[PDB]
Amino acid sequence: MAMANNSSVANKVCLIVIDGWGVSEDPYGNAILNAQTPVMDKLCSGNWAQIEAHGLHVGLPEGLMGNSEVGHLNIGAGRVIYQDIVRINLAVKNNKFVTNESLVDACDRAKNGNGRLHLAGLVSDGGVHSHIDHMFALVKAIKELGVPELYLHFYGDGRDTSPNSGVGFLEQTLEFLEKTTGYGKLATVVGRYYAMDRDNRWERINVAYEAMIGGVGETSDEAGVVEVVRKRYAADETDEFLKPIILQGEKGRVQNDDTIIFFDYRADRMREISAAMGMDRYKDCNSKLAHPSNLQVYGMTQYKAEFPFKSLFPPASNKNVLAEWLAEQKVSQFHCAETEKYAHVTFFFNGGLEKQFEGEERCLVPSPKVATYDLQPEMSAAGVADKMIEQLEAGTHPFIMCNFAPPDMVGHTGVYEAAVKACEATDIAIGRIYEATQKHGYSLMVTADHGNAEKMKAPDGGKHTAHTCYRVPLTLSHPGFKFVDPADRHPALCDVAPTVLAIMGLPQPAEMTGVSIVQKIKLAAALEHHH
Amino acid sequence: XRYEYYKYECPKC
Ligand code: NA
Ligand SMILES: [Zn+2]
Ligand SMILES: [Zn+2]
């Protein structure tokens, strides 16, 4: 089970990832603070750190709580794993559209053809399928690239935003196109119920299709379109269900030889309209209008493997996550979790794929077969520690890691008293592991993938069952290292694996763009600091 | 939150 370079490791490391254990100073409904956790009370003192596990720090949209899949992905990868909204928002901030290869291709086609380009997508700040800022940036870039004509097909939201917020986004859009860029024309408004169907209800898609290719709908212009929407509002027709509104007449329709960019980043609700325009699914619409010839369609992301469309943001890769890299260094490793989080210490920790690397030994501890986990809040934490202690007493693997599920899965039941017991059981397990690590020459690091159990009561005293935005601990028993935050940002989950490799005396692969957040210090200086 | 329950902004858990 060993690997050839095990004897080159400077420090063996045991990494405990507690699931759903965050750092909150508010004791109300705080199952971690109120639980008896004498082990974590000591580990989380002196030289320890509090690192970010939510929102932009882990590649999630700003303000969004962490989660087990993203958390284990970021911990295992040693880099920020960007979700699409964050990656595209950064490209907007950094003016990266104007040099985007697929966008430049689309703009070249229009300039070498009939000069006509279309943008189509959900216009709101919801951030779930699209962002209005993305569309504004595309307009700016397409102007800078000198496309003669740009037409916008505005899909109404009211689902990821309030049902009457479309008027505002419409007002913002009109002012933007007229005053800010003085370029581009709004051509269609239609609700996402029609344009963004994902249930193969092609009679819905046809309403959007015929609006874009044939102006089927209510005619309007820049001066009156907002009042039309207000009229629909008064008739109980909200953004999601806006029947089409047609501007610019025939000039703004999708015509023969035109170019189309769909700017939604999420695939499920673009597969249909994009394939109707760019492939053969216009047939399903059974329209009395002919399909325009020689169209070419581009997407913000890849909507389906088998679609031919170029994408502005193709899928990213994650080479040399920690588990891959340890194997490449010929260092063996051990991953352990109970059933409910076994995928997270394998599939997600290892980069989001079913791959076990060379030298990677795994251990699955069965979760208890109970109706809900508040009935056995300790879950199988004891058996996870048992397996880890076996590995520490053997000393075979220089890197071992486990997950402890109780705080998150009991936290999800909303039962505060059960969560307190889940945290007490986790603390006991961590203490038994800690004793073994100190006996057998392992440095112990404890972290979490995101918070949960520290906030068990909602503001009305009811159950709180969700993940949180609180920081998570990062501990280290090795006295020869001091935690140091990155120079330009808060520490985050992406920094755990670079830190482990630095402690292990192993190289850090170029692909891990996280930073190590420890510095070596002399033992005498460390001891004098504490006193 | 608003991303319920997309993989992996907000998976079922
Ligand atoms: Na406590
Ligand atoms: Zn989790
Ligand atoms: Zn959870």
Coordinates of C-alpha atoms and ligand atoms in Angstrom, one line a residue:
Chain A
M1 CA 0.0 0.0 0.0
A2 CA 3.0 2.3 0.4
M3 CA 4.6 4.3 -2.5
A4 CA 8.3 4.8 -3.3
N5 CA 8.8 8.3 -2.0
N6 CA 7.1 8.0 1.4
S7 CA 10.4 8.4 3.2
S8 CA 11.0 11.8 1.6
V9 CA 8.0 13.5 3.3
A10 CA 9.1 16.1 5.9
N11 CA 5.9 15.7 8.0
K12 CA 3.1 13.3 7.8
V13 CA -0.3 15.1 7.8
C14 CA -3.7 14.0 9.0
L15 CA -6.5 16.3 7.6
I16 CA -9.9 16.2 9.2
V17 CA -12.7 17.9 7.3
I18 CA -15.6 18.5 9.6
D19 CA -18.8 18.8 7.6
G20 CA -21.0 21.8 8.5
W21 CA -18.8 23.3 11.3
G22 CA -18.5 27.1 11.1
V23 CA -17.1 29.9 13.4
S24 CA -19.8 32.2 14.8
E25 CA -19.4 34.3 17.9
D26 CA -23.2 34.5 18.4
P27 CA -24.3 31.8 20.9
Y28 CA -28.0 31.8 19.9
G29 CA -28.7 28.4 18.3
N30 CA -25.0 27.8 18.1
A31 CA -24.7 24.0 18.6
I32 CA -20.9 24.3 18.3
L33 CA -20.4 26.9 21.0
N34 CA -23.0 25.5 23.4
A35 CA -21.8 21.9 22.9
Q36 CA -19.0 20.5 25.1
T37 CA -16.1 20.5 22.6
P38 CA -13.0 20.7 24.8
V39 CA -10.8 19.2 22.1
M40 CA -11.7 21.8 19.4
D41 CA -11.6 24.5 22.1
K42 CA -7.8 23.7 22.5
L43 CA -7.0 23.1 18.8
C44 CA -8.8 26.4 17.9
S45 CA -6.6 28.5 20.1
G46 CA -3.1 29.9 19.8
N47 CA -1.8 29.3 16.2
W48 CA -5.0 28.6 14.3
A49 CA -6.7 30.4 11.4
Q50 CA -10.3 31.2 10.2
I51 CA -10.7 30.7 6.5
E52 CA -13.5 31.5 4.0
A53 CA -15.7 28.7 2.7
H54 CA -18.5 30.6 0.9
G55 CA -19.3 33.0 -1.9
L56 CA -16.5 34.4 -4.1
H57 CA -13.8 33.0 -1.9
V58 CA -14.7 29.5 -3.1
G59 CA -15.9 30.4 -6.6
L60 CA -19.6 30.7 -5.6
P61 CA -21.7 33.8 -6.3
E62 CA -21.2 36.7 -3.9
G63 CA -22.9 36.2 -0.6
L64 CA -23.9 32.5 -1.3
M65 CA -23.5 30.0 1.5
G66 CA -20.9 27.2 1.0
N67 CA -21.8 23.6 0.4
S68 CA -20.3 20.1 0.6
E69 CA -19.6 19.7 -3.1
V70 CA -17.9 23.0 -3.7
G71 CA -16.2 22.8 -0.3
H72 CA -14.5 19.4 -1.0
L73 CA -13.7 20.5 -4.6
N74 CA -11.9 23.6 -3.4
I75 CA -10.1 21.8 -0.5
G76 CA -9.0 19.0 -2.8
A77 CA -8.0 21.2 -5.7
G78 CA -5.8 23.8 -4.1
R79 CA -7.3 26.5 -6.3
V80 CA -10.6 28.4 -6.6
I81 CA -13.1 26.4 -8.6
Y82 CA -15.1 29.0 -10.4
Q83 CA -18.8 28.6 -11.1
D84 CA -19.9 30.2 -14.3
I85 CA -21.4 33.4 -12.8
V86 CA -18.2 34.3 -11.0
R87 CA -15.9 33.4 -13.9
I88 CA -18.0 35.5 -16.3
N89 CA -18.4 38.4 -13.8
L90 CA -14.6 38.5 -13.6
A91 CA -14.3 38.6 -17.4
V92 CA -16.6 41.6 -17.5
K93 CA -14.7 43.4 -14.7
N94 CA -11.4 42.8 -16.5
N95 CA -12.6 43.8 -20.0
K96 CA -12.0 40.3 -21.3
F97 CA -14.9 40.0 -23.7
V98 CA -13.4 42.2 -26.4
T99 CA -10.5 39.7 -26.9
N100 CA -12.6 36.6 -26.3
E101 CA -11.8 34.2 -29.1
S102 CA -15.3 33.0 -29.7
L103 CA -16.8 36.5 -29.5
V104 CA -14.2 37.8 -31.9
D105 CA -15.1 35.0 -34.3
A106 CA -18.8 35.9 -34.1
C107 CA -18.0 39.6 -34.7
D108 CA -15.8 38.7 -37.7
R109 CA -18.5 36.6 -39.3
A110 CA -20.9 39.5 -39.0
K111 CA -18.4 42.0 -40.4
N112 CA -17.5 39.6 -43.3
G113 CA -21.2 38.9 -43.9
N114 CA -24.4 41.1 -43.7
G115 CA -23.1 43.0 -40.6
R116 CA -26.1 41.9 -38.5
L117 CA -25.6 40.3 -35.0
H118 CA -28.1 39.4 -32.3
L119 CA -27.9 39.0 -28.5
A120 CA -30.6 36.9 -26.8
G121 CA -31.0 36.1 -23.2
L122 CA -32.5 36.6 -19.8
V123 CA -32.3 40.3 -18.8
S124 CA -32.2 40.6 -15.0
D125 CA -29.6 40.7 -12.2
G126 CA -30.9 37.3 -11.0
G127 CA -27.5 35.7 -11.7
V128 CA -28.9 32.2 -12.0
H129 CA -29.2 31.9 -15.8
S130 CA -27.6 35.2 -16.8
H131 CA -26.7 38.6 -15.7
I132 CA -27.7 41.9 -17.3
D133 CA -24.1 43.1 -16.8
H134 CA -22.9 40.4 -19.1
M135 CA -25.2 41.7 -21.8
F136 CA -24.1 45.2 -21.3
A137 CA -20.5 44.1 -21.6
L138 CA -21.2 42.2 -24.8
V139 CA -22.8 45.3 -26.3
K140 CA -19.8 47.4 -25.4
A141 CA -17.3 44.8 -26.8
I142 CA -19.3 44.3 -30.0
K143 CA -19.3 48.0 -30.6
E144 CA -15.6 48.2 -30.1
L145 CA -15.1 45.3 -32.5
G146 CA -17.0 47.3 -35.2
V147 CA -20.1 45.2 -35.9
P148 CA -22.5 47.3 -38.1
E149 CA -25.8 46.3 -36.4
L150 CA -26.7 44.7 -33.0
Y151 CA -30.2 43.7 -32.0
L152 CA -31.2 42.6 -28.5
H153 CA -33.9 40.0 -27.6
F154 CA -34.9 40.6 -24.0
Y155 CA -36.2 37.5 -22.1
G156 CA -38.3 38.5 -19.1
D157 CA -37.4 37.0 -15.8
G158 CA -39.6 37.5 -12.7
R159 CA -38.5 34.1 -11.3
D160 CA -34.9 34.9 -10.2
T161 CA -36.0 38.5 -9.6
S162 CA -39.3 40.1 -8.5
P163 CA -42.2 39.5 -10.9
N164 CA -42.5 43.2 -11.8
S165 CA -38.7 44.1 -12.0
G166 CA -38.7 43.7 -15.8
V167 CA -39.7 47.4 -16.2
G168 CA -36.6 48.5 -14.3
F169 CA -34.2 46.3 -16.3
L170 CA -36.0 47.5 -19.5
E171 CA -35.6 51.1 -18.5
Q172 CA -31.9 50.5 -17.7
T173 CA -31.4 48.7 -21.0
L174 CA -33.0 51.5 -23.1
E175 CA -30.9 54.2 -21.3
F176 CA -27.8 52.1 -21.7
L177 CA -28.2 51.5 -25.5
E178 CA -29.1 55.2 -26.2
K179 CA -26.9 57.2 -23.8
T180 CA -24.1 55.0 -22.6
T181 CA -23.1 53.2 -25.8
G182 CA -25.3 55.0 -28.4
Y183 CA -25.2 51.6 -30.2
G184 CA -27.5 48.6 -30.4
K185 CA -31.3 48.3 -30.6
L186 CA -33.9 46.4 -28.5
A187 CA -35.8 44.1 -30.9
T188 CA -37.9 41.8 -28.7
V189 CA -39.3 41.4 -25.2
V190 CA -40.8 38.0 -24.3
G191 CA -41.2 36.1 -21.0
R192 CA -38.8 33.3 -20.1
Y193 CA -41.9 30.9 -19.9
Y194 CA -41.8 31.0 -23.7
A195 CA -38.1 31.5 -24.7
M196 CA -36.5 29.4 -22.0
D197 CA -38.6 26.2 -21.8
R198 CA -36.8 23.1 -20.8
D199 CA -39.7 20.6 -20.8
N200 CA -39.9 20.0 -24.6
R201 CA -43.0 22.2 -24.8
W202 CA -42.2 23.5 -28.2
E203 CA -45.5 25.4 -28.5
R204 CA -43.9 27.7 -25.8
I205 CA -40.6 28.0 -27.7
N206 CA -42.6 28.8 -30.9
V207 CA -43.9 32.0 -29.3
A208 CA -40.4 33.3 -28.8
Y209 CA -39.2 31.9 -32.1
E210 CA -41.9 33.6 -34.1
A211 CA -41.3 36.9 -32.2
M212 CA -37.6 36.8 -33.1
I213 CA -37.9 35.6 -36.8
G214 CA -41.3 37.1 -37.7
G215 CA -42.3 39.9 -35.3
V216 CA -45.4 38.0 -34.2
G217 CA -46.6 39.9 -31.1
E218 CA -47.4 43.4 -30.1
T219 CA -45.6 46.2 -32.0
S220 CA -44.0 49.0 -30.0
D221 CA -41.1 51.3 -29.9
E222 CA -38.5 52.7 -27.5
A223 CA -40.9 55.4 -26.3
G224 CA -43.8 53.1 -25.5
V225 CA -42.4 49.7 -24.7
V226 CA -42.2 50.4 -20.9
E227 CA -45.8 51.4 -20.8
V228 CA -46.8 48.2 -22.6
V229 CA -45.1 46.1 -19.9
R230 CA -46.9 48.2 -17.3
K231 CA -50.1 47.4 -19.1
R232 CA -49.4 43.7 -19.0
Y233 CA -48.5 44.0 -15.3
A234 CA -52.0 45.5 -14.7
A235 CA -53.5 42.5 -16.5
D236 CA -51.7 40.1 -14.1
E237 CA -49.1 39.2 -16.8
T238 CA -45.7 39.3 -15.1
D239 CA -42.2 39.3 -16.5
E240 CA -42.1 35.5 -16.7
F241 CA -45.2 35.3 -18.9
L242 CA -44.9 38.5 -21.0
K243 CA -46.3 37.7 -24.5
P244 CA -44.0 39.1 -27.1
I245 CA -43.4 42.8 -27.8
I246 CA -41.8 43.6 -31.1
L247 CA -39.6 46.6 -31.8
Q248 CA -37.6 47.9 -34.8
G249 CA -40.1 46.1 -37.1
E250 CA -38.6 43.7 -39.7
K251 CA -35.1 45.2 -39.3
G252 CA -34.8 43.7 -35.8
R253 CA -35.9 40.1 -36.8
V254 CA -33.5 37.2 -37.1
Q255 CA -33.0 37.1 -40.9
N256 CA -31.1 35.1 -43.5
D257 CA -27.4 35.0 -42.9
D258 CA -27.6 36.7 -39.4
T259 CA -25.4 35.9 -36.4
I260 CA -26.8 35.1 -33.0
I261 CA -25.2 35.0 -29.5
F262 CA -27.1 33.6 -26.6
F263 CA -25.7 35.2 -23.5
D264 CA -27.3 32.9 -20.8
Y265 CA -24.6 30.8 -19.2
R266 CA -26.9 28.0 -17.8
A267 CA -27.5 25.2 -20.3
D268 CA -30.9 23.7 -19.3
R269 CA -33.0 26.7 -20.4
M270 CA -31.0 27.5 -23.5
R271 CA -30.8 24.0 -25.1
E272 CA -34.2 24.4 -26.8
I273 CA -34.2 28.0 -28.2
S274 CA -30.5 27.7 -29.2
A275 CA -31.2 24.4 -31.1
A276 CA -34.3 25.9 -32.7
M277 CA -32.2 28.8 -34.1
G278 CA -28.9 26.9 -34.8
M279 CA -29.9 23.3 -35.5
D280 CA -33.1 21.5 -36.6
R281 CA -35.4 22.0 -33.7
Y282 CA -37.3 24.8 -35.4
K283 CA -39.2 21.9 -37.0
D284 CA -40.7 21.1 -33.6
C285 CA -42.2 24.6 -33.5
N286 CA -44.5 23.9 -36.5
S287 CA -44.4 27.5 -37.5
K288 CA -46.0 29.0 -40.5
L289 CA -42.8 31.1 -40.9
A290 CA -39.8 29.8 -42.8
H291 CA -36.6 29.2 -40.9
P292 CA -34.0 31.8 -41.8
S293 CA -31.1 30.3 -43.8
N294 CA -27.4 30.4 -43.1
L295 CA -27.6 31.3 -39.4
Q296 CA -24.8 30.8 -37.0
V297 CA -25.3 30.5 -33.3
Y298 CA -22.8 31.1 -30.4
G299 CA -23.4 30.4 -26.7
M300 CA -22.0 31.9 -23.6
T301 CA -21.1 28.4 -22.4
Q302 CA -21.4 24.9 -23.9
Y303 CA -25.1 23.9 -23.8
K304 CA -24.7 20.3 -24.9
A305 CA -21.7 18.2 -25.9
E306 CA -23.3 17.4 -29.3
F307 CA -24.1 21.0 -30.1
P308 CA -21.7 22.5 -32.8
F309 CA -21.9 26.1 -31.3
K310 CA -18.8 27.9 -30.3
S311 CA -18.8 28.9 -26.7
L312 CA -17.4 32.1 -25.1
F313 CA -16.5 30.1 -21.9
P314 CA -15.7 26.5 -22.6
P315 CA -15.5 24.0 -19.7
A316 CA -12.5 24.3 -17.4
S317 CA -10.1 21.6 -16.4
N318 CA -8.6 20.8 -13.0
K319 CA -5.2 19.1 -13.5
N320 CA -3.1 18.1 -10.4
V321 CA -5.6 18.3 -7.6
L322 CA -4.0 17.1 -4.3
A323 CA -4.8 13.4 -4.8
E324 CA -3.5 13.3 -8.3
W325 CA -0.4 15.2 -7.2
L326 CA 0.5 13.0 -4.3
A327 CA 0.4 10.0 -6.5
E328 CA 2.6 11.8 -9.1
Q329 CA 5.1 12.4 -6.2
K330 CA 4.9 8.6 -5.3
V331 CA 3.3 9.4 -1.9
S332 CA 0.5 7.2 -0.7
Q333 CA -2.7 8.5 0.8
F334 CA -5.9 7.4 2.7
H335 CA -9.4 8.9 2.3
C336 CA -12.2 8.0 4.8
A337 CA -15.8 9.0 5.3
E338 CA -19.2 7.5 6.2
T339 CA -21.8 6.9 3.5
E340 CA -23.5 10.3 3.5
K341 CA -20.2 12.1 2.6
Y342 CA -18.2 9.3 0.9
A343 CA -18.7 10.9 -2.5
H344 CA -17.2 14.1 -1.1
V345 CA -13.9 12.6 0.0
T346 CA -13.7 10.8 -3.3
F347 CA -15.6 12.2 -6.3
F348 CA -15.5 15.8 -5.2
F349 CA -12.2 15.9 -3.3
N350 CA -10.5 14.4 -6.3
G351 CA -11.8 17.1 -8.7
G352 CA -15.3 16.0 -9.5
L353 CA -14.8 12.7 -11.2
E354 CA -14.8 8.9 -10.4
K355 CA -11.0 8.4 -10.3
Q356 CA -8.9 6.7 -7.6
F357 CA -5.3 7.5 -8.0
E358 CA -2.3 5.2 -7.5
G359 CA -1.5 4.7 -3.8
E360 CA -4.9 6.1 -2.8
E361 CA -6.5 3.8 -0.2
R362 CA -10.1 4.4 0.6
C363 CA -12.4 3.4 3.5
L364 CA -16.2 3.7 3.5
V365 CA -17.8 3.5 7.0
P366 CA -21.6 2.7 6.8
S367 CA -23.9 5.5 7.9
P368 CA -26.6 4.4 10.4
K369 CA -29.8 3.1 8.9
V370 CA -32.1 5.4 10.8
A371 CA -35.1 7.4 9.6
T372 CA -33.6 10.8 10.3
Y373 CA -30.1 11.5 11.6
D374 CA -31.3 13.4 14.7
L375 CA -32.3 10.0 16.0
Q376 CA -28.6 9.0 16.0
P377 CA -26.8 12.4 16.1
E378 CA -23.3 10.7 16.6
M379 CA -23.9 9.0 13.2
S380 CA -20.7 6.9 12.4
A381 CA -18.1 9.4 13.6
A382 CA -16.8 6.8 16.0
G383 CA -16.1 4.3 13.3
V384 CA -14.4 6.9 11.1
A385 CA -12.0 7.7 13.9
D386 CA -11.4 4.0 14.4
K387 CA -10.2 3.6 10.8
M388 CA -8.1 6.7 11.0
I389 CA -6.5 5.6 14.2
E390 CA -5.6 2.3 12.6
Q391 CA -3.9 4.2 9.8
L392 CA -2.0 6.4 12.2
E393 CA -0.8 3.4 14.3
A394 CA 0.4 1.7 11.1
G395 CA 2.1 4.9 9.7
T396 CA 1.9 3.7 6.1
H397 CA 0.3 6.7 4.5
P398 CA 2.0 10.1 4.9
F399 CA -1.2 11.9 4.0
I400 CA -4.5 10.7 5.5
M401 CA -7.8 12.6 5.5
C402 CA -11.4 12.0 6.6
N403 CA -14.8 13.7 6.7
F404 CA -17.1 13.9 9.8
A405 CA -20.7 14.2 8.7
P406 CA -22.8 14.7 11.9
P407 CA -22.7 18.5 12.2
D408 CA -24.0 19.0 8.6
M409 CA -26.5 16.1 8.3
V410 CA -27.9 16.6 11.9
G411 CA -27.8 20.3 11.2
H412 CA -30.1 19.8 8.3
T413 CA -32.7 18.3 10.5
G414 CA -33.1 21.6 12.3
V415 CA -33.2 19.9 15.8
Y416 CA -30.9 22.1 17.9
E417 CA -30.5 19.5 20.7
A418 CA -29.5 16.8 18.2
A419 CA -26.9 19.1 16.6
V420 CA -25.4 19.8 20.0
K421 CA -24.9 16.0 20.5
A422 CA -23.6 15.7 16.9
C423 CA -20.9 18.3 17.7
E424 CA -20.0 16.6 21.0
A425 CA -19.7 13.3 19.2
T426 CA -17.5 14.9 16.5
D427 CA -15.3 16.5 19.2
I428 CA -14.8 13.2 20.9
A429 CA -13.8 11.6 17.6
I430 CA -11.3 14.4 16.8
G431 CA -9.8 14.0 20.3
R432 CA -9.1 10.3 19.8
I433 CA -7.5 11.0 16.4
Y434 CA -5.4 13.8 17.9
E435 CA -4.0 11.6 20.6
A436 CA -3.0 9.1 17.9
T437 CA -1.4 11.8 15.7
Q438 CA 0.7 13.0 18.6
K439 CA 1.8 9.4 19.4
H440 CA 2.7 8.4 15.9
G441 CA 4.4 11.5 14.4
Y442 CA 1.5 13.1 12.4
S443 CA 0.7 16.8 12.2
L444 CA -3.1 17.3 12.7
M445 CA -5.0 19.8 10.7
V446 CA -8.7 20.3 11.2
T447 CA -10.9 22.3 8.9
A448 CA -14.5 22.3 7.6
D449 CA -16.1 22.5 4.2
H450 CA -18.6 25.2 5.2
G451 CA -20.7 26.1 8.2
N452 CA -24.1 24.8 9.3
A453 CA -24.4 23.7 12.9
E454 CA -23.3 27.0 14.4
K455 CA -26.7 28.5 13.3
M456 CA -29.5 26.2 14.2
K457 CA -32.3 28.7 15.0
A458 CA -33.9 31.1 12.6
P459 CA -34.6 34.7 13.6
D460 CA -38.1 33.6 14.7
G461 CA -36.9 30.8 16.9
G462 CA -37.7 28.2 14.3
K463 CA -35.5 25.6 12.7
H464 CA -32.5 26.7 10.6
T465 CA -31.5 23.9 8.3
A466 CA -29.1 25.5 5.7
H467 CA -25.4 26.0 5.2
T468 CA -23.9 29.3 6.3
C469 CA -21.5 32.1 5.2
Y470 CA -19.4 31.8 8.3
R471 CA -15.7 31.1 8.2
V472 CA -14.4 27.6 9.1
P473 CA -11.4 26.7 11.3
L474 CA -8.0 25.7 10.1
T475 CA -5.9 24.2 12.9
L476 CA -2.3 22.8 13.0
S477 CA -0.6 20.9 15.8
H478 CA 2.9 21.4 14.4
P479 CA 4.7 24.1 16.5
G480 CA 7.3 24.9 13.8
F481 CA 4.8 26.7 11.6
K482 CA 2.9 30.0 12.0
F483 CA -0.3 30.8 10.1
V484 CA 0.0 33.8 7.8
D485 CA -2.9 35.2 5.7
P486 CA -2.4 35.9 2.0
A487 CA -1.2 39.4 1.2
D488 CA -4.2 40.5 -0.8
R489 CA -7.2 38.5 0.4
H490 CA -8.8 36.4 3.1
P491 CA -7.5 32.8 3.4
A492 CA -9.9 30.3 1.9
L493 CA -10.4 26.6 1.1
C494 CA -8.2 26.9 -1.9
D495 CA -5.2 27.4 0.4
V496 CA -5.6 24.1 2.4
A497 CA -3.8 21.8 -0.1
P498 CA -0.9 24.2 -0.8
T499 CA -0.5 24.4 3.0
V500 CA -0.5 20.7 3.4
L501 CA 2.1 20.2 0.7
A502 CA 4.4 22.9 2.3
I503 CA 4.1 21.1 5.7
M504 CA 4.8 17.8 4.0
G505 CA 7.8 19.2 2.3
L506 CA 6.4 18.4 -1.2
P507 CA 6.4 20.5 -4.3
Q508 CA 3.3 22.5 -5.2
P509 CA 2.1 22.0 -8.8
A510 CA 1.7 25.1 -11.0
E511 CA -2.0 24.4 -11.4
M512 CA -2.6 24.9 -7.6
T513 CA -3.0 28.7 -7.6
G514 CA -4.0 28.7 -4.0
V515 CA -1.3 29.9 -1.6
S516 CA 0.3 28.2 1.4
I517 CA -0.8 30.2 4.5
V518 CA 2.0 28.9 6.9
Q519 CA 5.5 30.2 7.4
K520 CA 8.2 28.1 9.1
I521 CA 9.3 29.6 12.5
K522 CA 11.9 28.4 14.9
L523 CA 10.5 26.4 17.8
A524 CA 12.1 28.7 20.4
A525 CA 10.4 31.7 18.8
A526 CA 7.1 29.8 18.8
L527 CA 7.4 28.9 22.5
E528 CA 8.3 32.5 23.5
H529 CA 5.3 33.8 21.5
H530 CA 2.7 31.7 23.4
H531 CA 4.1 32.7 26.8
Chain B
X1 CA -30.7 30.2 -1.9
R2 CA -31.8 31.4 -5.4
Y3 CA -29.7 28.7 -7.0
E4 CA -31.7 25.7 -5.5
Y5 CA -30.9 23.0 -6.5
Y6 CA -28.3 23.4 -9.3
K7 CA -25.1 21.4 -9.4
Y8 CA -23.0 22.7 -7.9
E9 CA -24.1 26.2 -6.8
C10 CA -26.7 24.7 -4.5
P11 CA -27.1 20.9 -4.6
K12 CA -29.6 18.9 -2.6
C13 CA -28.0 18.1 0.7
Ligands
NA1 NA -18.3 24.3 22.5
ZN2 ZN -20.6 19.8 3.7
ZN3 ZN -25.3 20.0 3.9

